[PDB]
Each structure stands twice: as structure tokens, then as C-alpha cells.
Amino acid sequence: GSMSSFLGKWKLSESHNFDAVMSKLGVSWATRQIGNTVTPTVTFTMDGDKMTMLTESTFKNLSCTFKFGEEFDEKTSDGRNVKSVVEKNSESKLTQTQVDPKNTTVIVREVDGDTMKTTVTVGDVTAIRNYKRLS
Ligand SMILES: CCCCCCCC/C=C\CCCCCCCC(=O)O
């Protein structure tokens, strides 16, 4: 099936330069501190033309469901209403674009074996967050 390497659960293992990106996004001090501490678990399932990503943490539990190439409305974990689309780059890579009125966030997720690397870019600032596959 499609995106089969994404399927299952993933837990954040490492984060590099993430404060630079939320700072740039205008995220509140207090939510930024939570964002620099919590280690979420992310679950992907693929059900038809649709992928679902569930994010679970002590802060918030959050889900989104999408068709590739199809714009949709999203509220981010920090509370911003954004227009997003997720594009399929390959069976092992997808790119999510989130457009708020102040900024645009590009989130690339690429699976390589037991690592999902998530690259987050807002203008000229980039963060990389590595997730390990669970079980
Ligand atoms: C990883 C998101 C869950 C963290 C919740 C705490 C609040 C985070 C603040 C701003 C998030 C906006 C930046 C985009 C996050 C996606 C990155 C990812 O999947 O690891």
C-alpha cells in the first residue's frame, strides 16, 4: 500500500534548532517552553485516499486527516488557524505546507528505516526533529 513505511507509531528522540522556528512563528513564551520539553508520539494510518496523523503529548492530543494535494483547514497545537496541504514526494517522503497570515511553515517528513526525520522551515530558519519508530 501507499506510504506503508510511515504506518505505525513514532516517538520524538531529538530536536535541533526548534526554538528558532517557534520564536519566528510568534509562539508564546509559555507554549514555546512546553514545545522545547515535551516528546510527542505520532501515529500514522492510511485509510483509502486519506492519511491520518495523530499526535499525543502531555500538552495536547491532536489529529488531522487529509487527501494528498487537497487543501484543508487546520488548527495547530499552539492555536493558529492555518490552511494546509500535504503533498506526496515519494512513498517515503511527504511535505506539509501550513499557511498562517504572518508566516508559512514547510514540514518535510521522510522515513528511513527506523528514523522519521521531520525538517521544519519558516523562511530562512530550519529545525530538524528525529523520531524513532516504536515497537
Ligand atoms: C511537534 C508538535 C507538538 C508540540 C506541541 C507544543 C507546541 C509547539 C509549538 C509550535 C509548533 C509549530 C511548528 C510545527 C510543528 C511540527 C513539527 C513536528 O512534527 O515535530
JSON list of C-alpha atoms and ligand atoms in Angstrom, two decimals:
[
{"chain": "A", "resi": 1, "resn": "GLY", "atom": "CA", "xyz": [0.00, 0.00, 0.00]},
{"chain": "A", "resi": 2, "resn": "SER", "atom": "CA", "xyz": [0.99, 3.64, -0.27]},
{"chain": "A", "resi": 3, "resn": "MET", "atom": "CA", "xyz": [3.11, 5.39, 2.37]},
{"chain": "A", "resi": 4, "resn": "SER", "atom": "CA", "xyz": [3.50, 1.98, 4.03]},
{"chain": "A", "resi": 5, "resn": "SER", "atom": "CA", "xyz": [6.84, 2.91, 5.67]},
{"chain": "A", "resi": 6, "resn": "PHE", "atom": "CA", "xyz": [5.07, 5.67, 7.67]},
{"chain": "A", "resi": 7, "resn": "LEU", "atom": "CA", "xyz": [2.45, 3.38, 9.21]},
{"chain": "A", "resi": 8, "resn": "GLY", "atom": "CA", "xyz": [2.59, 2.82, 12.92]},
{"chain": "A", "resi": 9, "resn": "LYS", "atom": "CA", "xyz": [3.85, 4.90, 15.84]},
{"chain": "A", "resi": 10, "resn": "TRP", "atom": "CA", "xyz": [6.83, 7.21, 16.28]},
{"chain": "A", "resi": 11, "resn": "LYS", "atom": "CA", "xyz": [8.30, 8.98, 19.32]},
{"chain": "A", "resi": 12, "resn": "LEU", "atom": "CA", "xyz": [10.39, 12.15, 19.24]},
{"chain": "A", "resi": 13, "resn": "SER", "atom": "CA", "xyz": [14.05, 11.33, 20.07]},
{"chain": "A", "resi": 14, "resn": "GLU", "atom": "CA", "xyz": [15.92, 14.53, 19.20]},
{"chain": "A", "resi": 15, "resn": "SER", "atom": "CA", "xyz": [15.25, 18.14, 18.34]},
{"chain": "A", "resi": 16, "resn": "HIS", "atom": "CA", "xyz": [17.70, 20.66, 16.80]},
{"chain": "A", "resi": 17, "resn": "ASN", "atom": "CA", "xyz": [17.10, 24.41, 16.45]},
{"chain": "A", "resi": 18, "resn": "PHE", "atom": "CA", "xyz": [13.36, 24.22, 17.20]},
{"chain": "A", "resi": 19, "resn": "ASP", "atom": "CA", "xyz": [13.20, 27.32, 19.42]},
{"chain": "A", "resi": 20, "resn": "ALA", "atom": "CA", "xyz": [14.39, 29.46, 16.48]},
{"chain": "A", "resi": 21, "resn": "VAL", "atom": "CA", "xyz": [11.33, 28.36, 14.48]},
{"chain": "A", "resi": 22, "resn": "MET", "atom": "CA", "xyz": [8.64, 28.84, 17.06]},
{"chain": "A", "resi": 23, "resn": "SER", "atom": "CA", "xyz": [10.14, 32.11, 18.11]},
{"chain": "A", "resi": 24, "resn": "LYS", "atom": "CA", "xyz": [9.88, 33.19, 14.48]},
{"chain": "A", "resi": 25, "resn": "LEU", "atom": "CA", "xyz": [6.26, 31.92, 14.28]},
{"chain": "A", "resi": 26, "resn": "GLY", "atom": "CA", "xyz": [5.35, 34.20, 17.18]},
{"chain": "A", "resi": 27, "resn": "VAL", "atom": "CA", "xyz": [4.52, 31.35, 19.58]},
{"chain": "A", "resi": 28, "resn": "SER", "atom": "CA", "xyz": [4.00, 32.49, 23.14]},
{"chain": "A", "resi": 29, "resn": "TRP", "atom": "CA", "xyz": [6.83, 32.16, 25.63]},
{"chain": "A", "resi": 30, "resn": "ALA", "atom": "CA", "xyz": [4.92, 29.61, 27.74]},
{"chain": "A", "resi": 31, "resn": "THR", "atom": "CA", "xyz": [3.88, 27.41, 24.79]},
{"chain": "A", "resi": 32, "resn": "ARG", "atom": "CA", "xyz": [7.46, 27.64, 23.45]},
{"chain": "A", "resi": 33, "resn": "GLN", "atom": "CA", "xyz": [8.78, 26.22, 26.73]},
{"chain": "A", "resi": 34, "resn": "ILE", "atom": "CA", "xyz": [6.30, 23.32, 26.50]},
{"chain": "A", "resi": 35, "resn": "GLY", "atom": "CA", "xyz": [7.34, 22.83, 22.85]},
{"chain": "A", "resi": 36, "resn": "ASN", "atom": "CA", "xyz": [11.03, 22.68, 23.90]},
{"chain": "A", "resi": 37, "resn": "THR", "atom": "CA", "xyz": [10.31, 19.97, 26.53]},
{"chain": "A", "resi": 38, "resn": "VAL", "atom": "CA", "xyz": [7.51, 17.55, 25.51]},
{"chain": "A", "resi": 39, "resn": "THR", "atom": "CA", "xyz": [8.28, 14.48, 23.46]},
{"chain": "A", "resi": 40, "resn": "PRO", "atom": "CA", "xyz": [5.21, 13.57, 21.45]},
{"chain": "A", "resi": 41, "resn": "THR", "atom": "CA", "xyz": [4.20, 10.25, 19.99]},
{"chain": "A", "resi": 42, "resn": "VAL", "atom": "CA", "xyz": [2.89, 10.36, 16.39]},
{"chain": "A", "resi": 43, "resn": "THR", "atom": "CA", "xyz": [0.74, 7.62, 14.82]},
{"chain": "A", "resi": 44, "resn": "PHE", "atom": "CA", "xyz": [0.05, 7.32, 11.07]},
{"chain": "A", "resi": 45, "resn": "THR", "atom": "CA", "xyz": [-2.73, 5.24, 9.49]},
{"chain": "A", "resi": 46, "resn": "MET", "atom": "CA", "xyz": [-3.71, 5.15, 5.82]},
{"chain": "A", "resi": 47, "resn": "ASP", "atom": "CA", "xyz": [-7.41, 4.52, 5.15]},
{"chain": "A", "resi": 48, "resn": "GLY", "atom": "CA", "xyz": [-8.34, 4.88, 1.48]},
{"chain": "A", "resi": 49, "resn": "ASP", "atom": "CA", "xyz": [-7.49, 8.12, -0.28]},
{"chain": "A", "resi": 50, "resn": "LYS", "atom": "CA", "xyz": [-6.86, 9.50, 3.23]},
{"chain": "A", "resi": 51, "resn": "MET", "atom": "CA", "xyz": [-3.96, 9.58, 5.68]},
{"chain": "A", "resi": 52, "resn": "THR", "atom": "CA", "xyz": [-4.44, 10.35, 9.38]},
{"chain": "A", "resi": 53, "resn": "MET", "atom": "CA", "xyz": [-1.73, 11.63, 11.70]},
{"chain": "A", "resi": 54, "resn": "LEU", "atom": "CA", "xyz": [-2.41, 11.53, 15.47]},
{"chain": "A", "resi": 55, "resn": "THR", "atom": "CA", "xyz": [-0.13, 13.49, 17.82]},
{"chain": "A", "resi": 56, "resn": "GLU", "atom": "CA", "xyz": [-0.24, 12.64, 21.53]},
{"chain": "A", "resi": 57, "resn": "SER", "atom": "CA", "xyz": [1.54, 14.51, 24.33]},
{"chain": "A", "resi": 58, "resn": "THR", "atom": "CA", "xyz": [1.00, 15.78, 27.88]},
{"chain": "A", "resi": 59, "resn": "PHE", "atom": "CA", "xyz": [0.22, 19.15, 26.32]},
{"chain": "A", "resi": 60, "resn": "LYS", "atom": "CA", "xyz": [-2.40, 18.28, 23.71]},
{"chain": "A", "resi": 61, "resn": "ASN", "atom": "CA", "xyz": [-3.72, 15.25, 21.78]},
{"chain": "A", "resi": 62, "resn": "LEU", "atom": "CA", "xyz": [-4.43, 16.24, 18.21]},
{"chain": "A", "resi": 63, "resn": "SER", "atom": "CA", "xyz": [-5.42, 14.53, 14.93]},
{"chain": "A", "resi": 64, "resn": "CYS", "atom": "CA", "xyz": [-5.56, 15.56, 11.22]},
{"chain": "A", "resi": 65, "resn": "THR", "atom": "CA", "xyz": [-6.93, 13.64, 8.21]},
{"chain": "A", "resi": 66, "resn": "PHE", "atom": "CA", "xyz": [-6.11, 14.59, 4.60]},
{"chain": "A", "resi": 67, "resn": "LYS", "atom": "CA", "xyz": [-6.02, 13.71, 0.93]},
{"chain": "A", "resi": 68, "resn": "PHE", "atom": "CA", "xyz": [-2.68, 14.47, -0.76]},
{"chain": "A", "resi": 69, "resn": "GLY", "atom": "CA", "xyz": [-2.81, 17.74, -2.81]},
{"chain": "A", "resi": 70, "resn": "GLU", "atom": "CA", "xyz": [-6.09, 18.76, -1.18]},
{"chain": "A", "resi": 71, "resn": "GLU", "atom": "CA", "xyz": [-6.10, 22.00, 0.84]},
{"chain": "A", "resi": 72, "resn": "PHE", "atom": "CA", "xyz": [-7.71, 21.76, 4.25]},
{"chain": "A", "resi": 73, "resn": "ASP", "atom": "CA", "xyz": [-8.28, 23.83, 7.37]},
{"chain": "A", "resi": 74, "resn": "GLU", "atom": "CA", "xyz": [-6.15, 23.06, 10.43]},
{"chain": "A", "resi": 75, "resn": "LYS", "atom": "CA", "xyz": [-5.66, 24.44, 13.92]},
{"chain": "A", "resi": 76, "resn": "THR", "atom": "CA", "xyz": [-2.05, 23.93, 15.06]},
{"chain": "A", "resi": 77, "resn": "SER", "atom": "CA", "xyz": [-1.06, 22.73, 18.54]},
{"chain": "A", "resi": 78, "resn": "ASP", "atom": "CA", "xyz": [-0.22, 26.29, 19.56]},
{"chain": "A", "resi": 79, "resn": "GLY", "atom": "CA", "xyz": [-3.61, 27.61, 18.38]},
{"chain": "A", "resi": 80, "resn": "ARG", "atom": "CA", "xyz": [-3.05, 29.15, 14.94]},
{"chain": "A", "resi": 81, "resn": "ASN", "atom": "CA", "xyz": [-5.70, 28.62, 12.23]},
{"chain": "A", "resi": 82, "resn": "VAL", "atom": "CA", "xyz": [-3.88, 27.70, 9.04]},
{"chain": "A", "resi": 83, "resn": "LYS", "atom": "CA", "xyz": [-4.55, 26.43, 5.53]},
{"chain": "A", "resi": 84, "resn": "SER", "atom": "CA", "xyz": [-2.57, 23.27, 4.90]},
{"chain": "A", "resi": 85, "resn": "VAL", "atom": "CA", "xyz": [-1.86, 20.82, 2.13]},
{"chain": "A", "resi": 86, "resn": "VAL", "atom": "CA", "xyz": [0.25, 17.68, 2.33]},
{"chain": "A", "resi": 87, "resn": "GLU", "atom": "CA", "xyz": [2.00, 16.56, -0.86]},
{"chain": "A", "resi": 88, "resn": "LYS", "atom": "CA", "xyz": [3.40, 13.09, -1.58]},
{"chain": "A", "resi": 89, "resn": "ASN", "atom": "CA", "xyz": [7.06, 13.41, -2.68]},
{"chain": "A", "resi": 90, "resn": "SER", "atom": "CA", "xyz": [7.60, 9.64, -2.77]},
{"chain": "A", "resi": 91, "resn": "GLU", "atom": "CA", "xyz": [6.41, 6.51, -0.90]},
{"chain": "A", "resi": 92, "resn": "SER", "atom": "CA", "xyz": [8.77, 7.55, 1.95]},
{"chain": "A", "resi": 93, "resn": "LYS", "atom": "CA", "xyz": [8.53, 11.37, 1.94]},
{"chain": "A", "resi": 94, "resn": "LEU", "atom": "CA", "xyz": [5.73, 13.95, 2.30]},
{"chain": "A", "resi": 95, "resn": "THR", "atom": "CA", "xyz": [5.75, 17.70, 2.56]},
{"chain": "A", "resi": 96, "resn": "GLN", "atom": "CA", "xyz": [3.19, 19.73, 4.59]},
{"chain": "A", "resi": 97, "resn": "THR", "atom": "CA", "xyz": [2.75, 23.42, 3.99]},
{"chain": "A", "resi": 98, "resn": "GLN", "atom": "CA", "xyz": [0.93, 25.44, 6.68]},
{"chain": "A", "resi": 99, "resn": "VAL", "atom": "CA", "xyz": [-0.04, 28.99, 5.77]},
{"chain": "A", "resi": 100, "resn": "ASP", "atom": "CA", "xyz": [-0.94, 31.43, 8.53]},
{"chain": "A", "resi": 101, "resn": "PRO", "atom": "CA", "xyz": [-1.33, 35.20, 7.76]},
{"chain": "A", "resi": 102, "resn": "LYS", "atom": "CA", "xyz": [2.06, 36.11, 9.25]},
{"chain": "A", "resi": 103, "resn": "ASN", "atom": "CA", "xyz": [4.10, 33.09, 8.02]},
{"chain": "A", "resi": 104, "resn": "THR", "atom": "CA", "xyz": [4.35, 29.87, 6.05]},
{"chain": "A", "resi": 105, "resn": "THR", "atom": "CA", "xyz": [5.74, 26.66, 7.62]},
{"chain": "A", "resi": 106, "resn": "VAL", "atom": "CA", "xyz": [7.03, 23.84, 5.44]},
{"chain": "A", "resi": 107, "resn": "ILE", "atom": "CA", "xyz": [7.28, 20.44, 7.20]},
{"chain": "A", "resi": 108, "resn": "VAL", "atom": "CA", "xyz": [9.04, 17.65, 5.36]},
{"chain": "A", "resi": 109, "resn": "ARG", "atom": "CA", "xyz": [8.76, 14.13, 6.86]},
{"chain": "A", "resi": 110, "resn": "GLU", "atom": "CA", "xyz": [10.97, 11.44, 5.46]},
{"chain": "A", "resi": 111, "resn": "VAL", "atom": "CA", "xyz": [11.20, 7.82, 6.65]},
{"chain": "A", "resi": 112, "resn": "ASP", "atom": "CA", "xyz": [14.49, 5.98, 6.52]},
{"chain": "A", "resi": 113, "resn": "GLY", "atom": "CA", "xyz": [14.34, 2.66, 8.27]},
{"chain": "A", "resi": 114, "resn": "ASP", "atom": "CA", "xyz": [13.66, 3.30, 11.94]},
{"chain": "A", "resi": 115, "resn": "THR", "atom": "CA", "xyz": [14.00, 7.10, 11.68]},
{"chain": "A", "resi": 116, "resn": "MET", "atom": "CA", "xyz": [11.45, 9.64, 10.59]},
{"chain": "A", "resi": 117, "resn": "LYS", "atom": "CA", "xyz": [13.26, 12.91, 10.07]},
{"chain": "A", "resi": 118, "resn": "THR", "atom": "CA", "xyz": [11.00, 15.96, 10.25]},
{"chain": "A", "resi": 119, "resn": "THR", "atom": "CA", "xyz": [12.50, 19.16, 8.77]},
{"chain": "A", "resi": 120, "resn": "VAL", "atom": "CA", "xyz": [10.63, 22.37, 9.68]},
{"chain": "A", "resi": 121, "resn": "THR", "atom": "CA", "xyz": [11.40, 25.58, 7.76]},
{"chain": "A", "resi": 122, "resn": "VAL", "atom": "CA", "xyz": [9.94, 29.09, 8.20]},
{"chain": "A", "resi": 123, "resn": "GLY", "atom": "CA", "xyz": [11.67, 31.47, 5.75]},
{"chain": "A", "resi": 124, "resn": "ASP", "atom": "CA", "xyz": [15.44, 31.17, 6.29]},
{"chain": "A", "resi": 125, "resn": "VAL", "atom": "CA", "xyz": [15.20, 29.31, 9.68]},
{"chain": "A", "resi": 126, "resn": "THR", "atom": "CA", "xyz": [15.31, 25.47, 9.82]},
{"chain": "A", "resi": 127, "resn": "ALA", "atom": "CA", "xyz": [14.76, 22.93, 12.60]},
{"chain": "A", "resi": 128, "resn": "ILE", "atom": "CA", "xyz": [15.27, 19.16, 12.40]},
{"chain": "A", "resi": 129, "resn": "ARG", "atom": "CA", "xyz": [13.39, 16.71, 14.64]},
{"chain": "A", "resi": 130, "resn": "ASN", "atom": "CA", "xyz": [14.14, 12.99, 14.58]},
{"chain": "A", "resi": 131, "resn": "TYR", "atom": "CA", "xyz": [11.52, 10.40, 15.59]},
{"chain": "A", "resi": 132, "resn": "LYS", "atom": "CA", "xyz": [12.21, 6.71, 16.30]},
{"chain": "A", "resi": 133, "resn": "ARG", "atom": "CA", "xyz": [9.76, 4.04, 15.22]},
{"chain": "A", "resi": 134, "resn": "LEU", "atom": "CA", "xyz": [8.10, 2.36, 18.21]},
{"chain": "A", "resi": 135, "resn": "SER", "atom": "CA", "xyz": [7.91, -1.39, 18.91]},
{"chain": "B", "resi": 1, "resn": "LIG", "atom": "C1", "xyz": [5.63, 18.64, 17.34]},
{"chain": "B", "resi": 1, "resn": "LIG", "atom": "C2", "xyz": [4.38, 19.44, 17.62]},
{"chain": "B", "resi": 1, "resn": "LIG", "atom": "C3", "xyz": [3.89, 19.15, 19.05]},
{"chain": "B", "resi": 1, "resn": "LIG", "atom": "C4", "xyz": [4.49, 20.09, 20.10]},
{"chain": "B", "resi": 1, "resn": "LIG", "atom": "C5", "xyz": [3.40, 20.83, 20.89]},
{"chain": "B", "resi": 1, "resn": "LIG", "atom": "C6", "xyz": [3.91, 22.09, 21.60]},
{"chain": "B", "resi": 1, "resn": "LIG", "atom": "C7", "xyz": [3.72, 23.39, 20.82]},
{"chain": "B", "resi": 1, "resn": "LIG", "atom": "C8", "xyz": [4.65, 23.52, 19.61]},
{"chain": "B", "resi": 1, "resn": "LIG", "atom": "C9", "xyz": [4.68, 24.93, 19.06]},
{"chain": "B", "resi": 1, "resn": "LIG", "atom": "C10", "xyz": [4.63, 25.21, 17.75]},
{"chain": "B", "resi": 1, "resn": "LIG", "atom": "C11", "xyz": [4.52, 24.15, 16.67]},
{"chain": "B", "resi": 1, "resn": "LIG", "atom": "C12", "xyz": [4.62, 24.74, 15.27]},
{"chain": "B", "resi": 1, "resn": "LIG", "atom": "C13", "xyz": [5.75, 24.13, 14.44]},
{"chain": "B", "resi": 1, "resn": "LIG", "atom": "C14", "xyz": [5.37, 22.88, 13.64]},
{"chain": "B", "resi": 1, "resn": "LIG", "atom": "C15", "xyz": [5.49, 21.58, 14.45]},
{"chain": "B", "resi": 1, "resn": "LIG", "atom": "C16", "xyz": [5.64, 20.26, 13.64]},
{"chain": "B", "resi": 1, "resn": "LIG", "atom": "C17", "xyz": [6.95, 19.51, 13.96]},
{"chain": "B", "resi": 1, "resn": "LIG", "atom": "C18", "xyz": [6.89, 18.01, 14.26]},
{"chain": "B", "resi": 1, "resn": "LIG", "atom": "O1", "xyz": [6.11, 17.20, 13.80]},
{"chain": "B", "resi": 1, "resn": "LIG", "atom": "O2", "xyz": [7.82, 17.51, 15.07]}
]
